[PDB]
């Protein structure tokens, strides 16, 4: 009767929150492209079909995306395989020579400025005796003057000699299905109304995530994971001034970034088997690379996000925007990649409005930089090689990363300003549905049976 | 009433269900527990962590009276200071996740009780075997 006895139960559904190393699942269709034209296509695992997304009825679960893990590991290893895709490539040491640069041959108007400098120098051939005298073209954001005459040098020649990039690899994002090891599940919040934290009363268990594309944009998140119904915003303390406002809107915004210089390449021989690709002539005219968005789309989307911001800050609140007051060139700008070249645009015709509770396109003048110090590491940069022909791309702006302006008065306006900051928060726009649990079987419960002897 | 609703009798299937329906299929969480040049050593150290945490529960189960039975009675009575709940509820009212919160203080008392209740039954079996 009341003599209840302990009975253990092995293989019992319970889990605890934990954190262990997850792994890839590259799509098997992406295995046809030979020997790492993108990072992690031969290195890690071919995926599975139909991952067992299985419902968990009568289950609520306290998710989190700010104290979440697995966005630190994905940023960690994506840093690591970014260095893995740079260890085979050729070091670009012998370019640190005192340049001599003039204006490029162009119809120089005083309003426009010379973006590209000529920079003819000396450089050793594969023979140690001879030294060819070669010329190139270089952007103004890559040379500084050593101080008549006018002679420059590379900007990164101080403190960081850094490699070229092998034209076999490609900087496109491929989908990545992260999978848990044995004994660990991946909870996916299926709630169609779900901000950052909070119990998600409709979960489902998977083993491998959907295909994540790793992109690198500071402002204007691109090409991934649009929202379902509304424009969903999510943050930490919305009464904090240091926490970004990860905007995620519902309909995509089409961008039309291009580069209209032809920009012919040529191969200079550095040494034994060390080619260096430098931009030779530019065919046509020297015109500015730009991007386009639809003004009818952009103003309606700001009409959406000014409604959802008033959902958190009340009505009759005069929401206005401004243009990210200061910072470096990689935080004040919409810094991104397009086809293998690095556009730095100027979102200041965008983030300039004011909203009260009562066909043409917007053109963004971008600019290109060839050495690259993505993630702002100490002793790295990255000489992106030039690319042939006119360059043009089309992408979907999916989410913003806003930042409030830390007022301290009883005003109504809230001059919001965009700001990227840490790149992990981009991937928090991809890893908010998923938490990783550890299956912990072998529970124990009393019932009325005894081990007979 | 025709009962056409879909049911997913798969991994972690009854994870919200009652004890009388969760103990129907315990093997499904059991069997999906072992199977399923620098990112290969994360496979090595993920595998030998999986087989390690498999061996740890298979050792703690092994050194009790439950070799591979996966469900087994014991001889220790159930002190009501642990749970103080009725019996007629806790097999059809609550759920297993409610149990792990309801007992987690009282674990490491039960695991300590199990070792003497096994080794005492073990040596009493030897004292029974020695006389014959």
């Amino acid at each position, epitope marked *: 009767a009341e003599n209840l006895w302990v009975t253990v139960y092995y293989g019992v559904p319970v889990w605890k929150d934990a954190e262990t190393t997850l792994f890839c699942a590259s799509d098997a269709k992406a295995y046809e492209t030979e020997k790492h034209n993108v990072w992690a296509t031969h290195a890690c695992v071919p995926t599975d079909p*139909n991952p*067992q*997304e*299985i*419902h968990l*009825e009568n289950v609520t679960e306290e998710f989190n995306m700010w104290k979440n893990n697995m966005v630190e590991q994905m940023h960690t290893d994506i840093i690591s395989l970014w260095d893995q895709s740079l260890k085979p490539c050729v070091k670009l040491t012998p370019l640190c020579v005192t340049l001599q640069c003039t204006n490029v041959t162009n119809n120089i108007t005083d309003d426009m400025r010379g973006e590209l400098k000529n920079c003819s120098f000396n450089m050793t051939t594969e023979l140690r005796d001879k030294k060819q005298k070669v010329y190139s073209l270089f952007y103004r954001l890559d040379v500084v003057q050593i101080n008549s005459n006018k002679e420059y040098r590379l900007i990164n020649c101080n403190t960081s000699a850094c490699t070229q990039a092998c034209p076999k690899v490609s900087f496109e994002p491929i989908p990545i299905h992260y999978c848990a090891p044995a004994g660990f599940a991946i909870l996916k919040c299926k709630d*169609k109304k779900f901000n950052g934290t909070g119990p998600c009363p409709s979960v489902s268990t998977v083993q491998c995530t959907h295909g994540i594309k790793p992109v690198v944009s500071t402002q204007l998140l691109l090409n991934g994971s649009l929202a379902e*119904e509304e424009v969903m915003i999510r943050s930490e303390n919305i009464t904090n001034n240091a926490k970004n406002i990860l905007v995620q809107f519902n309909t995509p915004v089409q961008i039309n970034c291009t580069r209209p210089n032809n920009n012919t390449r040529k191969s200079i021989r550095i040494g034994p088997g060390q080619a260096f690709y430098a931009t030779g002539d530019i065919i046509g005219d020297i015109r500015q690379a730009h991007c386009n968005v639809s003004k009818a789309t952009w103003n309606e989307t700001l009409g959406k996000v000014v409604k959802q911001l008033r959902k958190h800050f009340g009505n009759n609140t005069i929401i206005r925007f401004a243009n990210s007051s200061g910072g470096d060139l990689e935080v004040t700008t919409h810094s991104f990649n397009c086809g293998g070249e690095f556009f730095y645009c100027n979102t200041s015709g965008l983030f300039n409005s004011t909203w009260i509770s009562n066909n043409d396109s917007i053109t963004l003048p971008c600019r290109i930089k060839q050495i690259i110090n993505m993630w702002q590491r100490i002793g790295q940069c990255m000489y992106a090689p030039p690319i042939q022909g006119v360059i043009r791309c089309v992408s979907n702006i999916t989410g913003l990363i806003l930042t409030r302006d830390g007022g301290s008065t009883n005003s109504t306006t809230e001059t919001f300003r965009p700001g990227g900051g840490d790149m992990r928060d981009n991937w928090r726009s991809e890893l908010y549905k998923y938490k990783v649990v550890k299956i912990e079987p072998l529970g124990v419960a009393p019932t009325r049976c005894k081990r007979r002897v | *009433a*025709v*009962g*056409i*609703g*879909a*049911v*997913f*009798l*798969g991994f972690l299937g009854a994870a919200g269900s009652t004890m009388g329906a969760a103990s129907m299929t315990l093997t499904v969480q059991a069997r999906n527990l072992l199977s399923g040049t620098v990112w290969g050593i994360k496979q090595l150290q993920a595998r030998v962590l999986a087989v390690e945490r498999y061996l740890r529960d298979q050792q703690l189960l092994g050194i009790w009276g439950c070799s591979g039975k996966l469900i087994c009675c014991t001889n220790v009575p159930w002190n009501s200071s642990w749970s103080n709940r009725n019996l007629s509820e806790i097999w059809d009212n609550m759920t297993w996740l409610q149990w792990d919160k309801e007992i987690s203080n009282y674990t490491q008392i039960i695991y300590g009780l199990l070792e003497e209740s096994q080794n005492q039954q073990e040596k009493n079996e030897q004292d029974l075997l020695a006389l014959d």
Partner: antibody, heavy 122, light 106 residues
Framework: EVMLVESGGGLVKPGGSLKLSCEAS????????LSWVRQTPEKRLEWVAT??????????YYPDSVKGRFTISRDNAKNTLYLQMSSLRSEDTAVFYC??????????????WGQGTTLTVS | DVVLTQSPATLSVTPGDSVSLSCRAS??????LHWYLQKSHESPRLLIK???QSISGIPSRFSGSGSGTDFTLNINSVETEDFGMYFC?????????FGAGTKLEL
């Protein structure tokens, strides 16, 4: 998302045969029960056939007006539902929808409907 | 077979008004009753599950009630997008059957 896309509809002479297909994606196909329901030119909805899901028993069900004539089947590996119709009648003329049921106890309802494919028997 | 009788067959209401749609079963289908909206040129869309259960993504203005044989679908401020053909459906017995629908026009 859950998608059911039917094909195979057409104009059939009476007495003929026709196999409809429904191609599904976005869910664990075998677990859900699936049905064909038709909508007549007067817009009335008539259930046509059901095949239960893997955890439902996987049997087939038909109303008397089609029994012995219509056959519902599934190919779970390709996530496709089929309806093989024989001894067709002019009354079979309708838009045929593939439909997916819900989950658990409160899931015998139709949860998702396809776009439909048209069958005309005359 | 279970005959489901929806009343009225057609109903005209101004957007913003509220409506009560009737479905009556020939046998008890106590909670076996679902409501679907089929707009013109579209597939039907589930409004209410098991007499009264609301559906994620369906506006809160859709509500269901009723038990046994007599059922009611309330729409408590009808919007322009709500106009269409309304079906009730039973799962109490084979064969599965629908009501004839209420057509709500503007």
């Amino acid at each position: 998302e859950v998608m059911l896309v039917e094909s195979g509809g057409g104009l059939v002479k009476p007495g003929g045969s026709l196999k409809l297909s429904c191609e599904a994606s976005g869910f664990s196909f075998g677990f859900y029960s699936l049905s064909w329901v038709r909508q007549t030119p007067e817009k009335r909805l008539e259930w046509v056939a059901t095949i239960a899901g893997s955890g439902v028993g996987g049997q087939t069900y038909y109303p008397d007006s089609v029994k012995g004539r219509f056959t519902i089947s599934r190919d779970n590996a390709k996530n496709t539902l089929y309806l093989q119709m024989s001894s067709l009648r002019s009354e079979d003329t309708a838009v045929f929808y593939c439909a997916r049921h819900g989950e658990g106890k409160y899931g015998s309802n139709f949860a998702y409907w396809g776009q439909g494919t048209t069958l005309t028997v005359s | 077979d279970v005959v489901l009788t929806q009343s009225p067959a057609t109903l005209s209401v101004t957007p913003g008004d509220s409506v009560s749609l009737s479905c009556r079963a020939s046998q008890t289908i106590s909670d076996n009753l679902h409501w679907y909206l089929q707009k013109s040129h579209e597939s039907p869309r589930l409004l209410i599950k098991y007499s009264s259960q609301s559906i994620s993504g369906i506006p809160s203005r859709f509500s269901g009630s009723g038990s046994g044989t007599d059922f009611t679908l309330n729409i408590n401020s009808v919007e322009t997008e709500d106009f269409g053909m309304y079906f009730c459906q039973q799962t109490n017995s084979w064969p599965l059957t629908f009501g004839a629908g209420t057509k709500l026009e503007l």
